Amino acid sequence: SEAYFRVESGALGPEENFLSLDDILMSHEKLPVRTETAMPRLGAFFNAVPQGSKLELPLWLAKGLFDNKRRILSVELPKIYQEGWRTVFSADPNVVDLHKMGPHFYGFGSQLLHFDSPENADISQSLLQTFIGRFRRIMDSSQNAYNEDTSALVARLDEMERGLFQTGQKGLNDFQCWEKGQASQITASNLVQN
Amino acid sequence: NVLLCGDPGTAKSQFLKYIEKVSSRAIFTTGQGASAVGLTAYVQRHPVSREWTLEAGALVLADRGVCLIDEFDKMNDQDRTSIHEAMEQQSISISKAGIVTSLQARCTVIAAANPIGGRYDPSLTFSEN
Amino acid sequence: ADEGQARKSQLQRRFKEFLRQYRVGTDRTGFTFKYRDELKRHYNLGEYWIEVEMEDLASFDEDLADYLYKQPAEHLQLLEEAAKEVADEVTRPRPSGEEVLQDIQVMLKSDASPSSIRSLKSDMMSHLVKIPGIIIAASAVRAKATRISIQCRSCRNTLTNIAMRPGLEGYALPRKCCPLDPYFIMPDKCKCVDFQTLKLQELPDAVPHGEMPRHMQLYCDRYLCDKVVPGNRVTIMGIYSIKKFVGVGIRSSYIRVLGIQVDTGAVSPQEEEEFRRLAALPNVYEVISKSIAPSIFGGTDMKKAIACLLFGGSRKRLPDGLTRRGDINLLMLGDPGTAKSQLLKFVEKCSPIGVYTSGKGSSAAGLTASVMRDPSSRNFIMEGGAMVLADGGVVCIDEFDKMREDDRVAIHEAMEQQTISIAKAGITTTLNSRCSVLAAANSVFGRWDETKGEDNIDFMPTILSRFDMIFIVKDEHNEERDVMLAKHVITLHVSALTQTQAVEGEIDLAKLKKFIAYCRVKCGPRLSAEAAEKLKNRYIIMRSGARQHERDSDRRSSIPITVRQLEAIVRIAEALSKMKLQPFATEADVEEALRLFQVSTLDAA
Amino acid sequence: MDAAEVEFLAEKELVTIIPNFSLDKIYLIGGDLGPFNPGLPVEVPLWLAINLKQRQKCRLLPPEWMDVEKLEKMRDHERKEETFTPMPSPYYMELTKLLLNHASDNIPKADEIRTLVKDMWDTRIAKLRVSADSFVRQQEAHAKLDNLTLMEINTSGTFLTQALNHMYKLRTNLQP
Amino acid sequence: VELREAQRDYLDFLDDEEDQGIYQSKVRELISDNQYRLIVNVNDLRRKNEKRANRLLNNAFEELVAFQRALKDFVASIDATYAKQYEEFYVGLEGSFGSKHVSPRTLTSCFLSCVVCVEGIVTKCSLVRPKVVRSVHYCPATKKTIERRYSDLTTLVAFPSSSVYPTKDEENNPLETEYGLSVYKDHQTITIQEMPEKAPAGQLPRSVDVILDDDLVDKAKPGDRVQVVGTYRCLPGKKGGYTSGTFRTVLIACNVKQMSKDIAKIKKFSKTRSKDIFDQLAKSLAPSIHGHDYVKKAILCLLLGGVERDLENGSHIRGDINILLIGDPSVAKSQLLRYVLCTAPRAIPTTGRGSSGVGLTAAVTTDQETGERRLEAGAMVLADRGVVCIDEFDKMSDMDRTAIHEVMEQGRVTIAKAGIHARLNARCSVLAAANPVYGRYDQYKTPMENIGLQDSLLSRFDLLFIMLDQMDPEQDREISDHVLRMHRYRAPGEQDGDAMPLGSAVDILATDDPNLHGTKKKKEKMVSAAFMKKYIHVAKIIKPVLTQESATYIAEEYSRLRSQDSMSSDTARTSPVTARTLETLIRLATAHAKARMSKTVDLQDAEEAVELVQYAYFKK
Amino acid sequence: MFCEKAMELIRELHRAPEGQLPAFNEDGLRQVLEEMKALYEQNQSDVNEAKSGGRSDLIPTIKFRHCSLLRNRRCTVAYLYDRLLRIRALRWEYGSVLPNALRFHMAAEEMEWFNNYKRSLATYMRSLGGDEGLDITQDMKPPKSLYIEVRCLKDYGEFEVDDGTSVLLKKNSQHFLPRWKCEQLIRQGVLEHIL
Ligand SMILES: Nc1ncnc2c1ncn2[C@@H]1O[C@H](COP(=O)(O)OP(=O)(O)NP(=O)(O)O)[C@@H](O)[C@H]1O
Ligand SMILES: Nc1ncnc2c1ncn2[C@@H]1O[C@H](COP(=O)(O)OP(=O)(O)NP(=O)(O)O)[C@@H](O)[C@H]1O
Ligand SMILES: Nc1ncnc2c1ncn2[C@@H]1O[C@H](COP(=O)(O)OP(=O)(O)NP(=O)(O)O)[C@@H](O)[C@H]1O
Ligand SMILES: [Mg+2]
Ligand SMILES: [Mg+2]
Ligand SMILES: [Mg+2]
Ligand SMILES: [Zn+2]
């Protein structure tokens, strides 16, 4: 029915959604870079920022400054997307804590491909295989954790996987309410709290 | 709880002995003969196991009887202050040698004492002597 | 015998049909197959256990419930096998890597009134028993074989998948294949489960007068391992039985546990909604303060301090690895007969983890930790004192002034650093003591004597600095307060018969306990920037006042004012915010923290 | 789509009732019904059947497939097969819930019928779980689910479709 | 019968000559180094054969004997004679093991027969003893030699052989043992304990027994934080004709890594780029603690240390620096100790009331592998070539400080207990913290009465600092600002309203995956903690030497300090200046030279060292 | 970094997934607009300096401030639009006249948008048929019964059932009425559907 629905996240696509709060928060996360030419007047922030300076700045700003000729700055991957952590994911995707390793792991990784790194293919394959490995546990936990504390199950999941978990939980709760007949009652909305 | 204060030769100890005889589960102790640890509870190496074990003191052995403390003024302070928890909260809480537990001490304490200098002087209040 | 196998198969089929057919609900609303769905969801989650209620089994088939009560050792095996096959037909087909079926542990519980340890006479042997108690010791998890394979040592023939009896009883190896003892047990080709022995002390309410508390050995199996820790209060459902490896025909007894019920952390969503509503309503602080020790007239600021202690601040690990304690330490010096001991006895009951100790009844080793020789192994082992037993909770040290100085010295590391560093008997470790110390004490001269001033306190400055808040709760005589207090006391004594009814504008003790646990695990606040600025300025003014008072007296004050007091105000404000589940402490939260600390600082003027 | 809406579609299925009232043919927009003669069977949509049973105006008759022998055969066939088997009705779970919750008195051996329908439901949801896992593991582009019912698809399909959208975008993010 | 397929898989994996040559190169390195276990990365095994990697981690014993036989075949193909020179070639596994990364607490019974990587702290070790694997015997009556292999439940094949040797009858003739032709392997048992901070709430740390064989026996001592990769197994404790189901469990280790022990060119460039890098390091020492600059410099000197001299006459001059902090409540003494415990390699915590003279030095304990009693090292012996932090030092018993006296004075401790009479090495720097008598420092009493310790003990400390809770308003302003800033801080990898989680295991690879200034602030370019750890680890080794100018200035200023004591106030002098103070001056100058990585103690080092001594001796 | 004040608007809305409407962050909106004004003034000064003086090194920082400005715009527009989504859900979940405790959270322009949306929605609903349109806001759940039993939660005024017939909605009184007449009051919480 006509319930409130957030603007959906478009982080996994070629470009993120403009009005998505999730995409905005995802792109806020910082990204290491190396500056290719000195920038005047910005020494107050990191008077000129000298050439060759290492910086960590937001992903939206890195994408804004980044032109494919690599004229202003060079963009480097975060550690969690480099080969060692990709190997960690290859070991067993179920045990890594993607909530602590950036809450928007898949969205940040997908937008990290925009900079045309030589290991873009490796990053993409790592993201795909991580999702494939974690899918079954997400599915079973979401669809079988009925009416209990879901904190331990949902703790290690990134925000995309948390959305999938809530979708599965919503389906489970809907079917259980149907089977026990509670779905037939007409009830006041959540706004009765006011 | 009762406290019998007064001068010598007034049958206070005799009253305590009578209460010992009439009442079941009664015990009697005196002054320096008592100790803090013996009054409340004591931790010992068990004789055959040699592991630490908690054991009942006076106020735990009289857990639903009367503990009689004669010549109460003449105890040591460390011995005398040990009965505070037993006298009001009616438990004896022990945290020793790995034992952390509280025993029941639902005991009525009846005590006898002399004032300062032995003889009670009516010129002073009870708290003053 | 075929007749015996027929009996076992029939009983297994009856248990199977119980698990297949049992329902709860009504036709007016709907039905859910309780144990079918529990089996399916637990197996899909990888839990491989269920919890069959004896009352439900009795309602479905009373004969099965009676058989399981009288002869649980025989029939629980059949019930577990029935649950295994029901899980198979309920869950299959299963994806790749889940083809092999797993064994199911059928725990069970009951609504019946429990028995007691001293009620366990000889006639209760091999029956189901339900007793309460307190766990005082807990073994490390060890592996017990459920099925073994034995290979002949000489000719290398093998006997495989020999079923081991459950519990602490063992199995006799055959003496025929070769030597008199032909066999060894193959360490690879055997299947083992976790097991854990516990010691269950009799409840202090249940000890008869003058007796020491008895204790009973427990055997926990598979998923019952680590379901309970020392200090917890439980109801244990199990099988009273002999161990089966002074006097001759004697056998030691123990309870094979098959159901654990914590009598009082996984909250239900309904309880979480209640806790969120409690955090959301505007007067939750006053509601909590009224809920703390409702039988105690007055002392509202001290109750508020106890609320801040119960909820506690937020632990913080800084970039250099140094950790700041979130726990709040609260001392209550003052006059006798002023409900200090009763407030401690309430906090012990109310805190999610709570340990009550008498200062005079304590020792340095018993408070922090003890090193003792293990009798069965000759090694020196560690034993948790009160501050380790209360880790993640509150220590209530009553009559705190009666401790010897060397024993009060022992808790200095645990009060501030929240660790107990030990170097004794060749074992060297750093235990955790993340706990709050709530202390009660009387004045040096019994009552607080205002003419003598700082001489009323014998505690050192070093230990006084470690207390976040220090109350000098003086008993001030006043006829109006005395009349109202006496009326309250007499009505309280009259109210010992009126069904223990609840009160408006108050949280039940159990609900308050669970709410404290929820807020503790969930919310860690911080200070807002302007609030921190306010606290900074007020700290400078306070320190200047303390310095000038000390200069005017030409004597150092007993109670100091230090950076610990600043951080104490910080964590008090964080506790106030954590009551409301707010990520930040506002200027009003810092104002209430300053007000409470000002009450505790007028008490140091 | 909600389970109540799947029940709403399931309520269109035709069932037979024995009225205890007299009423001539009524011309409904979805199709005329009746005449309703006392004591004689008449076929009506399930919503009207449940409404009349609630109002004590008829006795419901079970469908031909609500039979313990037939349901046991269907259950054993479902457990024996790997693919979803053809079900007796396209809304069998909802039919079972409505008819047994409202007319257990009329329908004999309703406990056995309910338990067998639950067995079939558990088996087929397990098959759907296996199908979803195989889909994601093998990175299939499409699946074939011929004999699934609408309630079975609705129970797990929102999660599965969202997960497959995420998987598709993850495996296609190297398009240039 | 089926393991030839697994052996073929492992031999195919090892023969890396076709594609990358990694593991043929590693086997070649093994041959050249004369070693007999190959270190294999299961990540590479995953990349080449995921199926075999999963089988290896879940079916460990059969897969490992297959892998070892494949390794023996491969090393025979590379070098046959070297393959004959060893009984069998082992394989130790490193890399990422997925869910098998466990602690001693989480290592439950479901992990049996699996490869598991256990992280923890070593509590004890048994003595190394040989273990027979194959004994060779000779028959003089027959001029013939025979052999017998031996196995027990610990071995991978796990059959229990008879313990005794063939003795008086083979061919009904007497045999005798050829010990030289027989082969024995080293055997050791250690106990790995859970990390104490990671236990849940009131639970004490749990532990698991570990068995080391052959070349692994040296690689762990008590106090080490290690990661042990091995196979988890139960040992049936049969009585003979009967057993209880209760079996003890052990971890047969195949690899051990020291996870806390452990490029220099960038350090040697940074010491040139930075100006007086000692000051920057000292300021960046404990960022959370404001002020106490000279104390931080002294702690950095303690961390770096002097150089221990051996004289031609055989006497030695102790190189460690000992620091005693005395001060009021709440002046960060305990926090400075905690920072040193976190930053330094092999820093042992200790507190005055919670320790004993026995536990500080050594205790007689029964080794349950045999029943014989041996010395188990105490705190200061564990701290050898390290630091020991003693909080509440004024609360120790005198009999307990008798132990500390020898350790500080001579760098040893003498023990005479059980069957052993020995001088144990206890060469450690002591960083002690104490409160003055009466809790708070009294300005109206002499320092020797505020300080309750005996003058004999105080002579053993290089530097003694008195630090006071002086309630100056400006100092209070800056301190409170820093404290509230620290309490306001939250980590970037944490949500805006999180309470920090209680400890749980979070290490999921045998080697660290993410492989110099702080970025937030402008003032003075604070150094990061990791770089400081690495720099101190490098700079401790430099070993600089005195110069004529620095020696002359140290001697002149020491003479000034001594002559200044003639008219200095006896009522307020912190400690009497003596030759011990001169030793302190030399050690501090050497430590400053180590900080600069200079290789020559210069006049700058002498100036800073004697400034520090002047402050410590004649300033509050 | 510049953007953090804009991120507080975003974090405010993201911290309430349930769809309830927080108070309008007027001060935060003023601050981010002031920041954009300052950024634009600096950018204009720098860009005209660079172009007039022929100085080329300014162009990276020009792009820096330009991207920062576009970021500020994206954040505030997303904030306003998500607030519009939350407001739009109120017409369907509760009804037309919002309670004053919630109406106090809305901006005046938000009430303007909401009134325009209500007028547009009512116009669309009227235009669906020849006379009286179709009230698609009703029939939110599938219908089960023609009549329902309802219980009055709020002490409330007279409620017309049909013309001269009406029912007094006094608290705890219980009526049996048509579902389509009672649906709006149940959704508003005046009535409780039972059974
Ligand atoms: N009123 C009395 N009637 C009978 N005997 C009495 C009375 N007063 C004292 N006595 C006797 O006095 C003797 C001493 O009694 P005792 O109980 O020891 O006195 P007390 O109060 O304890 N004096 P003291 O021990 O010095 O404090 C006993 O033989 C009593 O019987
Ligand atoms: N304000 C109060 N309201 C209710 N009961 C009170 C109050 N003050 C004292 N009491 C009662 O007085 C008795 C003694 O209380 P208690 O808890 O021992 O206070 P206390 O100050 O700790 N005593 P002490 O150990 O000598 O300092 C108990 O029965 C209390 O309930
Ligand atoms: N200069 C400071 N900067 C930051 N925090 C400080 C400072 N001085 C004290 N503190 C804080 O004060 C608290 C107590 O520190 P602590 O190290 O125990 O003091 P201490 O000198 O050891 N006093 P004590 O343990 O009573 O002898 C800690 O939380 C410190 O972080
Ligand atoms: Mg007498
Ligand atoms: Mg008390
Ligand atoms: Mg300290
Ligand atoms: Zn045999």
Numbering used by the authors:
A (entry chain F): 2 to 47, 58 to 205
B (entry chain 2): 518 to 646
C (entry chain 5): 21 to 197, 207 to 274, 285 to 303, 312 to 652
D (entry chain E): 1 to 176
E (entry chain 3): 10 to 271, 281 to 533, 552 to 656
F (entry chain D): 1 to 195
Sentences from the paper on this structure:
The human replisome is an elaborate arrangement of molecular machines responsible for accurate chromosome replication. At its heart is the CDC45‐MCM‐GINS (CMG) helicase, which, in addition to unwinding the parental DNA duplex, arranges many proteins including the leading‐strand polymerase Pol ε, together with TIMELESS‐TIPIN, CLASPIN and AND‐1 that have key and varied roles in maintaining smooth replisome progression. CMG is a hexameric ring of related MCM2‐7 subunits stabilised by CDC45 and the tetrameric GINS complex (Costa et al, 2011; Yuan et al, 2016). CMG translocates in a N‐tier first orientation (Georgescu et al, 2017; Douglas et al, 2018), with the leading‐strand template pulled 3′–5′ through a central pore in the MCM ring.
We have determined a 3.2 Å cryo‐EM structure of a human replisome comprising CMG, Pol ε, TIMELESS‐TIPIN, CLASPIN and AND‐1 bound to replication fork DNA. However, despite our MCM3 construct lacking these amino acids, we observed almost identical density in this region that we attribute to MCM3 residues 524‐533. In contrast to the hsCMG:ssDNA:ATP‐γ‐S structure, where ssDNA is held in the C‐tier pore by MCM6, 4, 7 and 3 (Rzechorzek et al, 2020), we observe 11 nt of ssDNA bound on the opposite side of the pore engaging MCM3, 5, 2 and 6. The SepB trimer is bound near‐perpendicular to the N‐tier face of CMG where it forms an extensive interface with CDC45 and the PSF2 subunit of GINS. TIMELESS‐TIPIN sits at the leading edge of the replisome in advance of MCM2, 6, 4 and 7 where it cradles the parental DNA duplex prior to strand separation. TIMELESS and TIPIN form a positively charged, concave groove that grips a complete turn of dsDNA ahead of the fork junction. Pol ε forms two multi‐subunit interfaces with CMG, one involving MCM2 and CDC45 (docking site 1) and the other involving MCM5 and PSF1 (docking site 2). Our structure shows that CLASPIN adopts an extended and flexible configuration stretching across one side of the replisome, from its N‐terminal association with TIMELESS, across MCM6 and MCM2, towards CDC45. Here, an invariant phenylalanine (MCM7 F285) stacks against the final base pair in a manner characteristic of separation pins in diverse helicases (Velankar et al, 1999; Gao et al, 2019). Although we observe only a single unpaired lagging‐strand nucleotide after strand separation, it is positioned at the mouth of a positively charged channel formed between the MCM3 and MCM5 ZnFs, strongly indicating that the unwound lagging‐strand template exits the secondary ZnF ring through this channel.
